[PDB]
Amino acid sequence: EVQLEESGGGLVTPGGSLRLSCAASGYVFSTYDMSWVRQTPEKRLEWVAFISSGGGRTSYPDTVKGRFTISRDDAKNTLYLQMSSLQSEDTAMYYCTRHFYAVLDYWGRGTTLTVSSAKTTPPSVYPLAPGSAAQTNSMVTLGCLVKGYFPEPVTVTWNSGSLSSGVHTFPAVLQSDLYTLSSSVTVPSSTWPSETVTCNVAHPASSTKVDKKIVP
Amino acid sequence: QAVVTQESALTTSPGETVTLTCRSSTGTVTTSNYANWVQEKPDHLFTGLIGATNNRAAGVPVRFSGSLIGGKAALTITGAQTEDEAIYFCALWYSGHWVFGGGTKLTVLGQPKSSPSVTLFPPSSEELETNKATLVCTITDFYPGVVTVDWKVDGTPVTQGMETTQPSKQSNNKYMASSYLTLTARAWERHSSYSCQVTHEGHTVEKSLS
Ligand SMILES: CO[C@H]1O[C@H](C)[C@@H](NC(=O)[C@H](O)CCO)[C@H](O)[C@@H]1O[C@H]1O[C@H](C)[C@@H](NC(=O)[C@H](O)CCO)[C@H](O)[C@@H]1OC
Numbered sequence A: 001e002v003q004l005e006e007s008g009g010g011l012v013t014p015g016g017s018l019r020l021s022c023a024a025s026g027y028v029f030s031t032y033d034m035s036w037v038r039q040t041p042e043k044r045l046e047w048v049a050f051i052s053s054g055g056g057r058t059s060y061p062d063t064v065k066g067r068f069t070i071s072r073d074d075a076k077n078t079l080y081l082q083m084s085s086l087q088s089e090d091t092a093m094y095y096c097t098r099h100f101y102a103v104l105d106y107w108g109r110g111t112t113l114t115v116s117s118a119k120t121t122p123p124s125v126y127p128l129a130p131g132s133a134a135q136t137n138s139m140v141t142l143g144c145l146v147k148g149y150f151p152e153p154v155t156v157t158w159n160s161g162s163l164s165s166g167v168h169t170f171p172a173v174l175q176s177d178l179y180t181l182s183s184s185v186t187v188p189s190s191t192w193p194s195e196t197v198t199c200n201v202a203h204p205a206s207s208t209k210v211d212k213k214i215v216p
Numbered sequence B: 001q002a003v004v005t006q007e008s009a010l011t012t013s014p015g016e017t018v019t020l021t022c023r024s025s026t027g028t029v030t031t032s033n034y035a036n037w038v039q040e041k042p043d044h045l046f047t048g049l050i051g052a053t054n055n056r057a058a059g060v061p062v063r064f065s066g067s068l069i070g071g072k073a074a075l076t077i078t079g080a081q082t083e084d085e086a087i088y089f090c091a092l093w094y095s096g097h098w099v100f101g102g103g104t105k106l107t108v109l110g111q112p113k114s115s116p117s118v119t120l121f122p123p124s125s126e127e128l129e130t131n132k133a134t135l136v137c138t139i140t141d142f143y144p145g146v147v148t149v150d151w152k153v154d155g156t157p158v159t160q161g162m163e164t165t166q167p168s169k170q171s172n173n174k175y176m177a178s179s180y181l182t183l184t185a186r187a188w189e190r191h192s193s194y195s196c197q198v199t200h201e202g203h204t205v206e207k208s209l210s
Helices: B185-190
Strands: A005-007 A018-023 A033-039 A045-051 A068-073 A078-083 A092-099 A104-107 A111-115 A124-128 A139-149 A155-158 A167-169 A173-175 A178-188 A198-203 A208-213 B009-012 B017-024 B036-041 B045-051 B065-068 B073-078 B086-094 B097-100 B104-108 B117-121 B133-142 B148-153 B162-164 B175-183 B194-199 B204-209
Touching: A005 A092, A018 A111, A033 A078, A033 A104, A033 B097, A045 A068, A045 A078, A045 B086, A045 B097, A078 A092, A092 B045, A104 B036, A124 A198, A124 A208, A139 A198, A139 B117, A139 B133, A155 A167, A155 A178, A173 B175, A178 B133, B009 B017, B017 B086, B017 B104, B073 B086, B117 B194, B117 B204, B133 B148, B133 B185, B133 B194, B148 B162, B148 B175, B175 B185, B175 B194
Parallel strands: B009 B104
Antiparallel strands: A005 A018, A018 A078, A033 A045, A033 A092, A068 A078, A092 A104, A092 A111, A104 B045, A124 A139, A139 A178, A155 A198, A167 A178, A173 A178, A198 A208, B017 B073, B036 B045, B036 B086, B065 B073, B086 B097, B086 B104, B117 B133, B133 B175, B148 B194, B162 B175, B194 B204
C-alpha cells in the first residue's frame, strides 16, 4: 500500500531558495499529520517542519525557524517544504514522513540537497604506490587519490573494467570545499609492476577522465 | 530543552535479546513524548519500528518492543536476527517539535569476526610538487564494523589534520574505512616517522613509514 516520493533537490548556492515536494500513495493522505526530516552528512537525523491534518498547525526548530515553510495540497496528495535563505548547514538528504497516529512509519526515498558555492572543478589524481619493497606476500595493494573535485560523484575504475578483483572506493571527504576520495586495488604481487595497473577516474560534471598508471 | 542520547554501539549474537535505551536531558521520559524508533537499513532506507512508546507498526515483527525504563525510552529486540544489524534512532515528541537522538549501531553476529588490514601510503612524487602531502591509511575487511584510528608523527599523537571516513559496508558484509592525515609538503620533508594505528576489537594493528 504506501509510497512517499519526495523530490526537487539539487545544487543551489548559499542564499538561494528551493521548494521540496513529497507525494503520497495508497493511503488517505488527508487525515494524517506530517513531517520533514533531514539526514545530514555527519549522519545525524534532524527534523525540519511539522504540519497538521488540515494544515492548521506548523512547528519548526529555531535553526530553520523563519527560513523554511511547510504545506500541503490535499487535492494533489503532496507535502511541500519551502526552503528560503539557504546556508551550507542545510546540505542534507531531505525526507518526508507521515505520522500514523504518532507512529512515524512510512518515509520517502529522500531527495539530496547540496548548498555549496563551489564550482565544477575536476580532480587531481595521484598514484598510491606501495613504497619500500616490504612484500607482505602473494598480495600487493595499490590505490589512487582523487583530490579536489566538486561536485560529486566520480566513478573510479581500474584498468578500464578489466580489474574488478576486489576494488574498494570510499565515501568522499569534504576538505574545505572540495571533495576527495580513494579507491584501492589488490592485484597479485607477481603482476605488478610487470603487468600494468592504471586507474581511470571520470568526473561527469566537468566531463573529465584521467589516466594514472601506478608505478613503483 | 532538547538533548536525547542513545548508546552509540551495542553488539549481540543472533538468538539473544538486546535492549537499547533513550535518555533525555529534560529529565524523565513520559508517554507524552511518543517514544518512536526508526530503523536505518543499508542505504538510507528508513522505517517506523515502534511509535508512541509501545505501538509496533504494521509489518514490524514480534521482537520489536517499546517500554519506558527508569524514565527512559527503550527498544527491546528479543531473539534478534541477522537482518537486524543496522542503525536505530529514537525521536521524542517535545510538544510541537521532534527531538532525535544520535542513533546506535547494532551489530548482530551474522558471520565470524575479522580484523582490518591497514595498508599505509606516502604522498607521491607528483602531489609533492604542489607543496602538499597526503598520506592515506586504508582500512578494509572488518566485522564488526567499528574502528578507532590514531595517527602519530614521530611518536607524538596527531591532534589535527587527520580525518577518517565512517565505516562502509563492503560487498561481503564486511566494512571499510579510510583515513587521511594531510601535511604541507614542508612538514612532510621534516618528521621521519608516520604511524597509522587502527584499534578494532581490543586488538590494535599498526602500519608505519619513514
Ligand atoms: C495532543 O494530543 C496529540 O495531538 C495534540 C494536539 C498534540 N499537541 C500539539 O499538537 C501541540 O504541541 C500543542 C502545543 O503546541 C499532542 O502533542 C499529541 O500529538 C501526538 O499524537 C497524535 C496521535 C499525532 N497525530 C497523529 O499521530 C496522526 O496523524 C493522527 C491523525 O489525526 C501527533 O502528531 C503527535 O504524535 C505523532
